Amino acid sequence: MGPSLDFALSLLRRNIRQVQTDQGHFTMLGVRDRLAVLPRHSQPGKTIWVEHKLINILDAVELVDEQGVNLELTLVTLDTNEKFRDITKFIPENISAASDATLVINTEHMPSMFVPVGDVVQYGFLNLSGKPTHRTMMYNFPTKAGQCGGVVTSVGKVIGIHIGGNGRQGFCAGLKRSYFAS
């Protein structure tokens, strides 16, 4: 097996989980310890369904930037025995463009799904169904409903979380390592 296929499959196995909230089916990225990230639209409650059981959420933080603008990411600390393999070394320090990225979706409806989205560019401001959002990136690929939370990855780097599309293009919230600092 090649290096990029091995990396994506290991990310799926060790870090990318099928979840359900009251808003429906989403992909969740576990980053380290009991810390995971969700797309804000998932609106996690006091418990979240993770793969095969209900998990209590100890803390949730909806991230905003220094202006108070939505970044469309929710950090959650889970009450679970699982400790996530620490992938913070694979998250860039600054929001980074990439060539020939893959979007990895994992929900009950779209399990272990690989989508060849192509180049990912800096985008910035996005109006997400009436909610203004900063620090987004863009791919010229017609993504569809049900892929929110999907993980954007390129050459061993974990660079974004899918947050929506316009029928011709898809958009992610950019990841940076400091979001996950202790």
Swiss-Prot record:
The Peptidase C3 domain extends over: 2-180
Catalytic activity reported: Selective cleavage of Gln-|-Gly bond in the poliovirus polyprotein. In other picornavirus reactions Glu may be substituted for Gln, and Ser or Thr for Gly
Disulfide connectivity for this sequence is none
- So which domain of life are we looking at? Viruses
Where is it located? Answer: Host cytoplasm
Q: Which residues are catalytic?
A: H41, E72, C148
Q: What does this protein do?
A: Major viral protease that mediates proteolytic processing of the polyprotein. Cleaves host EIF5B, contributing to host translation shutoff. Also cleaves host PABPC1, contributing to host translation shutoff. Disassembles host cytoplasmic stress granules by cleaving host G3BP1, although this effect is less prononced than the inhibition induced by protease 2A. Cleaves host RIGI and thus contributes to the inhibition of type I interferon production. Cleaves host IRF7 and thus contributes to the inhibition of type I interferon production.
Quaternary structure note = Interacts with host IFIH1/MDA5; this interaction inhibits host IFIH1. Interacts with host RIGI.
Task: Give the protein name, as stated in the record.
Answer: Protease 3C
Origin species, per record, is Human enterovirus 71
